[PDB]
Design an enzyme around this catalytic site. Structure first.
Site, PDB file in Angstrom:
ATOM      1  N   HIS A  40       0.590  -1.047  -0.414  1.00 39.60           N
ATOM      2  CA  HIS A  40       0.065  -0.092  -0.196  1.00 39.60           C
ATOM      3  C   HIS A  40       1.011   1.668  -0.130  1.00 39.60           C
ATOM      4  O   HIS A  40       0.683   2.709   0.174  1.00 39.60           O
ATOM      5  CB  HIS A  40      -1.004   0.137   1.244  1.00 39.60           C
ATOM      6  CG  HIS A  40      -0.552   0.559   2.567  1.00 39.60           C
ATOM      7  ND1 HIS A  40       0.172  -0.869   3.021  1.00 39.60           N
ATOM      8  CD2 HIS A  40      -0.644   1.419   3.511  1.00 39.60           C
ATOM      9  CE1 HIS A  40       0.326   0.105   4.229  1.00 39.60           C
ATOM     10  NE2 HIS A  40       0.080   0.839   4.307  1.00 39.60           N
ATOM     11  N   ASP A  84       0.160  -7.504   1.708  1.00 40.72           N
ATOM     12  CA  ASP A  84       0.438  -6.079   1.782  1.00 40.72           C
ATOM     13  C   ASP A  84       1.741  -6.279   2.131  1.00 40.72           C
ATOM     14  O   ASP A  84       2.374  -5.940   3.262  1.00 40.72           O
ATOM     15  CB  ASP A  84      -0.411  -5.001   3.073  1.00 40.72           C
ATOM     16  CG  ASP A  84       0.111  -3.930   3.045  1.00 40.72           C
ATOM     17  OD1 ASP A  84       0.683  -3.178   1.986  1.00 40.72           O
ATOM     18  OD2 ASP A  84      -0.048  -3.180   4.086  1.00 40.72           O
ATOM     19  N   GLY A 175       2.301   6.808   7.693  1.00 41.20           N
ATOM     20  CA  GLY A 175       4.088   7.269   8.249  1.00 41.20           C
ATOM     21  C   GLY A 175       4.816   6.312   8.688  1.00 41.20           C
ATOM     22  O   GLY A 175       6.028   6.294   8.294  1.00 41.20           O
ATOM     23  N   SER A 177       3.864   3.201   7.754  1.00 40.97           N
ATOM     24  CA  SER A 177       3.611   2.524   7.108  1.00 40.97           C
ATOM     25  C   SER A 177       4.712   0.970   5.984  1.00 40.97           C
ATOM     26  O   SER A 177       5.580   2.286   5.630  1.00 40.97           O
ATOM     27  CB  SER A 177       2.997   2.928   6.255  1.00 40.97           C
ATOM     28  OG  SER A 177       2.110   3.406   6.610  1.00 40.97           O
ATOM     29  N   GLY A 178       5.008   0.164   6.114  1.00 39.68           N
ATOM     30  CA  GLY A 178       6.316  -0.544   5.689  1.00 39.68           C
ATOM     31  C   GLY A 178       6.815  -0.630   6.275  1.00 39.68           C
ATOM     32  O   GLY A 178       7.753  -1.431   5.658  1.00 39.68           O
TER      33      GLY A 178
HETATM   34  N1  LIG Z   1       0.361   6.681  -0.615  1.00 39.45           N
HETATM   35  C1  LIG Z   1      -0.146   7.088   0.043  1.00 39.45           C
HETATM   36  N2  LIG Z   1      -1.135   7.854  -0.597  1.00 39.45           N
HETATM   37  C2  LIG Z   1      -0.528   6.326   1.037  1.00 39.45           C
HETATM   38  C3  LIG Z   1       0.605   5.753   2.006  1.00 39.45           C
HETATM   39  C4  LIG Z   1       0.015   5.648   3.462  1.00 39.45           C
HETATM   40  C5  LIG Z   1      -0.957   4.832   3.800  1.00 39.45           C
HETATM   41  N3  LIG Z   1      -1.485   4.903   4.849  1.00 39.45           N
HETATM   42  C6  LIG Z   1      -2.063   5.411   5.424  1.00 39.45           C
HETATM   43  C7  LIG Z   1      -3.133   4.804   6.248  1.00 39.45           C
HETATM   44  O1  LIG Z   1      -4.595   5.432   6.389  1.00 39.45           O
HETATM   45  C8  LIG Z   1      -2.904   4.111   7.196  1.00 39.45           C
HETATM   46  N4  LIG Z   1      -1.711   3.402   8.042  1.00 39.45           N
HETATM   47  C9  LIG Z   1      -1.572   2.801   8.578  1.00 39.45           C
HETATM   48  C10 LIG Z   1      -0.319   2.008   9.477  1.00 39.45           C
HETATM   49  C11 LIG Z   1      -0.295   1.472  10.883  1.00 39.45           C
HETATM   50  C12 LIG Z   1      -2.045   2.014  12.221  1.00 39.45           C
HETATM   51  C13 LIG Z   1      -1.891   0.949  12.621  1.00 39.45           C
HETATM   52  N5  LIG Z   1      -3.109   2.393  12.807  1.00 39.45           N
HETATM   53  N6  LIG Z   1      -1.285   0.642  13.318  1.00 39.45           N
HETATM   54  C14 LIG Z   1      -2.558   2.714  10.339  1.00 39.45           C
HETATM   55  C15 LIG Z   1      -2.599   2.753   9.390  1.00 39.45           C
HETATM   56  N7  LIG Z   1      -3.274   3.785   8.575  1.00 39.45           N
HETATM   57  N8  LIG Z   1      -2.969   6.033   4.172  1.00 39.45           N
HETATM   58  C16 LIG Z   1      -1.610   6.035   3.106  1.00 39.45           C
HETATM   59  C17 LIG Z   1      -1.890   6.612   1.682  1.00 39.45           C
HETATM   60 MG   LIG Z   2       8.273   2.709   9.565  1.00 32.75          MG
HETATM   61 ZN   LIG Z   3      -0.077   3.508   5.981  1.00 35.44          ZN
END
Ligand SMILES: NC(=[NH2+])c1ccc2nc(C(=O)c3nc4ccc(C(N)=[NH2+])cc4[nH]3)[nH]c2c1
Ligand SMILES: [Mg+2]
Ligand SMILES: [Zn+2]
Ligand SMILES: [Ca+2]
Length: 223
Positions: A40, A84, A175, A177-178
């Site tokens: 994602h 993912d 942020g 993420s990944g």
């Molecule tokens: N390329 C983009 N525009 C993008 C990139 C990363 C994103 N990430 C979210 C997100 O919506 C999102 N990433 C998450 C990671 C962990 C948790 C958590 N609560 N542990 C929640 C999260 N929500 N939207 C995103 C959009």
């Molecule tokens: Mg990280």
């Molecule tokens: Zn994310």
């Protein structure tokens, strides 16, 4: 990361920051030429930044390398976020040192209870927006699949696991993420999703990397 602490400059040497003019996702270095992140986090035009701590300041230990190719998992479902995971190849191989090192892929999956370290430059407020410039860390245990599935009925597959605190307060967030989830020296998870961040009875959901080791090894050897 919400409810975490400052890691310390270069204490997570396998952490990468994916940048497309700004930091948008984290990733993990698995060897000098490849990075694993979340699907994602897919974008075109990514530069991988290694040896980072403050992402707004060039402190001297960074390596900025562009990606030559991205491979999103063949079965990634962007609607359920199942599978993912994505692999990124670097245009040049990184120079590994104390500050830039690779993390090992697991030989088996980890047990509920195991304490892991999760890190990233993602949002730090559950209610609000505050983005840190230095790496933040969080130690959280893997939760039983039962408490994960109760929190997210019909949404958890065998390719996911939850980690965190049901009381809320601590969690990974957008942020992050990944990013990596390391337990006992092996990369066991990738930051994937959750319900908001640090909410009670809403733990973070991570990609279960032990289910993709053969796909990872086969893919990097053939690319
Ligand atoms: N390329 C983009 N525009 C993008 C990139 C990363 C994103 N990430 C979210 C997100 O919506 C999102 N990433 C998450 C990671 C962990 C948790 C958590 N609560 N542990 C929640 C999260 N929500 N939207 C995103 C959009
Ligand atoms: Mg990280
Ligand atoms: Zn994310
Ligand atoms: Ca920097």
């Amino acid at each position: 990361i919400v409810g975490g602490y400052t890691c310390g400059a270069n204490t997570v040497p396998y952490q990468v920051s994916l940048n497309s003019g700004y930091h948008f996702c984290g990733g993990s270095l698995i060897n000098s030429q490849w990075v694993v992140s979340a699907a994602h986090c897919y974008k075109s035009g990514i530069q991988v930044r290694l040896g980072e701590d403050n992402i707004n300041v060039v402190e001297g230990n960074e390596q900025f390398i562009s990606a030559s190719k991205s491979i999103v998992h063949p079965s990634y479902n962007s609607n359920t976020l199942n599978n993912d995971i994505m692999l990124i190849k670097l245009k040049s191989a990184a120079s590994l040192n104390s500050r830039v090192a690779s993390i090992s892929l697991p030989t088996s999956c980890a047990s509920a209870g195991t304490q892991c370290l999760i890190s990233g430059w993602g949002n730090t407020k559950s209610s609000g927006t505050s983005y840190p410039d230095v790496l933040k860390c969080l130690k959280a245990p893997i939760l039983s699949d039962s408490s994960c599935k109760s929190a997210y009925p019909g949404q958890i597959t065998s390719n996911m696991f939850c980690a965190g605190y049901l009381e809320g307060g601590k969690d990974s967030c957008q942020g992050d993420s990944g990013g990596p989830v390391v337990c006992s020296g092996k990369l066991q998870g990738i930051v994937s999703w959750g319900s908001g961040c640090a909410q009670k009875n809403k733990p973070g959901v991570y990609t279960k990397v032990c289910n993709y080791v053969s796909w990872i090894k086969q893919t990097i050897a053939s690319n």
